[PDB]
Amino acid sequence: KEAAFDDAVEERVINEEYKIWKKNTPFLYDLVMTHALEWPSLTAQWLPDVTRPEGKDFSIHRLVLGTHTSDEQNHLVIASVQLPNDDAQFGGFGSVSGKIEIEIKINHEGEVNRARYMPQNPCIIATKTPSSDVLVFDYTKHPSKPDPSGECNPDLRLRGHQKEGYGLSWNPNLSGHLLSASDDHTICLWDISAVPKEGKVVDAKTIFTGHTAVVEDVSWHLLHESLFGSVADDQKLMIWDTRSNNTSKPSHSVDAHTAEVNCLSFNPYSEFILATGSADKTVALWDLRNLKLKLHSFESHKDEIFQVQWSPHNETILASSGTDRRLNVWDLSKIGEEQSPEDAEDGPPELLFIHGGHTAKISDFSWNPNEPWVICSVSEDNIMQVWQMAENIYN
Amino acid sequence: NKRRKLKNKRRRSLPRPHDFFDAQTLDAIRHRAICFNLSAHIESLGKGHSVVFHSTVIAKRKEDSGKIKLLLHWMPEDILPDVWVNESERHQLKTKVVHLSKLPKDTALLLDPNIYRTMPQKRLKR
Amino acid sequence: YSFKCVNSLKEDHNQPLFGVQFNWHSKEGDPLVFATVGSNRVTLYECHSQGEIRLLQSYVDADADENFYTCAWTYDSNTSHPLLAVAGSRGIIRIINPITMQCIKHYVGHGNAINELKFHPRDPNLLLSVSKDHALRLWNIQTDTLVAIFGGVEGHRDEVLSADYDLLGEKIMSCGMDHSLKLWRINSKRMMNAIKESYDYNPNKTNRPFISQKIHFPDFSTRDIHRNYVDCVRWLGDLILSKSCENAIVCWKPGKMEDDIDKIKPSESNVTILGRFDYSQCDIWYMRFSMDFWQKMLALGNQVGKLYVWDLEVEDPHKAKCTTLTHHKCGAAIRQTSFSRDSSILIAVCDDASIWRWDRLR
Amino acid sequence: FYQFLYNNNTRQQTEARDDLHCPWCTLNCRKLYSLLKHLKLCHSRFIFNYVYHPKGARIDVSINECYDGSYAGNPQDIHRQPGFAFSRNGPVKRTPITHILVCRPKRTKASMSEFLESEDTYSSGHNRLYFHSDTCLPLRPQEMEVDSEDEKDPEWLREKTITQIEEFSDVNEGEKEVMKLWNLHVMKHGFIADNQMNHACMLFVENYGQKIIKKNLCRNFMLHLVSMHDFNLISIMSIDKAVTKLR
Amino acid sequence: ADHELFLQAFEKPTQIYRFLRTRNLIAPIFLHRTLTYMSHRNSRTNIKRKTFKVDDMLSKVEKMKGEQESHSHLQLTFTGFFHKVTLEVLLVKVCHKKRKDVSCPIRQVPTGKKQVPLNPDLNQTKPSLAVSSNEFEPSNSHMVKSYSLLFRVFVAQMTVFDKNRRLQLLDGEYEVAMQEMQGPTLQFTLRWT
Amino acid sequence: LERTEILNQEWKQRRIQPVHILTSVSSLRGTRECSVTSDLDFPTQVIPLKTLNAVASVPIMYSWSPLQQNFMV
Question: Which residues in this protein are found as Phosphoserine (chain A)?
Answer without folding.
Answer: 95, 340
